[PDB]
Amino acid sequence: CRSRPRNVPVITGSKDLQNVNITLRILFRPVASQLPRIFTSIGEDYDERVLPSITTEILKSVVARFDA
Amino acid sequence: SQLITQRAQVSLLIRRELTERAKDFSLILDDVAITELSFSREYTAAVEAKQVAQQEAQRAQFLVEKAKQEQRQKI
């Protein structure tokens, strides 16, 4: 339940449609109380199932609206 | 050019900003410096070419002095 940083690169198309490579560091950690549920659904390895999806979809959401 | 000259303050500012970025990552920064700053090919080469242009104007100035001496020599 301590903290870990995770780097997600995104080759995002900008407004002028320039393929810009942007590496985002997300520091993160789990939640103390709901670690039971976290294992019932996901397991011990909660982190890796999540960070890439949200981070890629969202850097795309952002830099899509932004230019090179 | 400022990154090269004003580089001490470049170090200071980059150090403040990375200190604030890396504090969230649970590590302690004490002493850090910016050490490599190179630019591709052309600034130094063109500066030296400008120096050579000035010194070549002077070289042609003494070509002009030998033009006086050939002036009166061939008179």
Side-chain angles (χ1 to χ4, degrees):
Chain A
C1 62
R2 291 153 172 189
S3 164
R4 168 182 290 192
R6 193 263 185 291
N7 308 326
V8 187
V10 182
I11 304 158
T12 175
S14 51
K15 186 60 173 173
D16 65 349
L17 200 45
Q18 292 294 92
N19 314 329
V20 191
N21 311 323
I22 306 160
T23 301
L24 188 83
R25 323 175 50 73
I26 310 88
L27 270 170
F28 80 93
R29 50 180 181 143
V31 296
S33 182
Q34 295 305 328
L35 295 170
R37 304 293 84 197
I38 288 169
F39 182 92
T40 52
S41 64
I42 312 170
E44 275 182 14
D45 315 329
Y46 50 84
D47 57 307
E48 298 152 356
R49 287 217 184 203
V50 167
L51 306 158
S53 176
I54 54 172
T55 302
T56 296
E57 184 194 4
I58 287 163
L59 273 71
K60 290 263 162 168
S61 165
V62 189
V63 180
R65 299 175 269 192
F66 301 158
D67 188 74
Chain B
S1 67
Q2 280 64 245
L3 280 158
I4 311 148
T5 56
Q6 187 274 331
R7 202 187 196 221
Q9 296 81 21
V10 176
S11 196
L12 315 187
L13 194 148
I14 283 172
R15 292 298 84 208
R16 185 195 66 191
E17 191 277 331
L18 176 51
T19 300
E20 54 80 13
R21 297 308 287 162
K23 267 177 181 177
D24 203 63
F25 294 74
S26 308
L27 302 173
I28 306 305
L29 309 185
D30 58 340
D31 180 27
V32 179
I34 295 177
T35 59
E36 188 203 359
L37 179 85
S38 57
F39 302 138
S40 50
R41 196 163 181 184
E42 189 273 331
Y43 67 116
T44 313
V47 169
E48 297 306 329
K50 159 180 71 175
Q51 192 64 259
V52 166
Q54 168 180 13
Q55 301 316 313
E56 176 270 317
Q58 296 186 339
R59 167 261 169 185
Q61 160 57 257
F62 278 147
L63 190 149
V64 180
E65 296 310 327
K66 70 179 284 293
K68 280 74 176 175
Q69 303 324 309
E70 178 278 354
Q71 171 65 294
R72 89 194 199 87
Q73 173 198 348
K74 282 201 175 174
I75 296 277

